[PDB]
Structure 1
Amino acid sequence: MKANEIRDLTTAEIEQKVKSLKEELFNLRFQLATGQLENTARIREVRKAIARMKTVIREREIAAN
């Protein structure tokens, strides 16, 4: 994915993806706490995805400086 997010745009596109994934994760945690859920790998996946999606931003800023 690295190349994908490094292709995408820093502030608007990528942050939109961030908040979208965070909404997803939120719903995941509710489904889990309720017991309506099966695929638990999604949670780890999404959290890691947000991490990469944020650190690309951080390196773009430090590249700016």
Structure 2
Amino acid sequence: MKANEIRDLTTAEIEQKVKSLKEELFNLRFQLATGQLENTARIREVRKAIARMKTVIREREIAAN
């Protein structure tokens, strides 16, 4: 997964992919708060995903600049 963010398209698809898993994160926090989420570690790994694959965007932008 540490490579796919570079391998796939430059910037376009990562954007709505960010918004999609941010949707997932919001849903995860809501089910956590109401006390129904089971697979907890999902909450960690989605945030890790967000961090890494917007870090990729930042480094790509600065490198291009």
Unaligned runs of 5+ in 1: none
Instruction: Quote how far apart the aligned CAs of 1:8 are.
Output: 1.4
Task: Report the TM-score when normalising by structure 2.
Answer: 0.93
The sequence identity of aligned pairs, in percent, is 100
Residue 54 of structure 1 aligns to a residue whose secondary structure is helix
Larger mean CA deviation between 48-57 and 6-15 belongs to 6-15
Aligned residues: 65
- CA deviations on 1:10-58 (whole Å, 9 max, x unpaired) are 3211111111000000000000000111111000000000001101101
Greater shift, 9-18 or 37-46, is seen at 9-18
Runs of 4+ aligned residues of structure 1 deviating over 3 Å after TM superposition are: none
The alignment yields a C-alpha RMSD, in angstroms, of 0.9
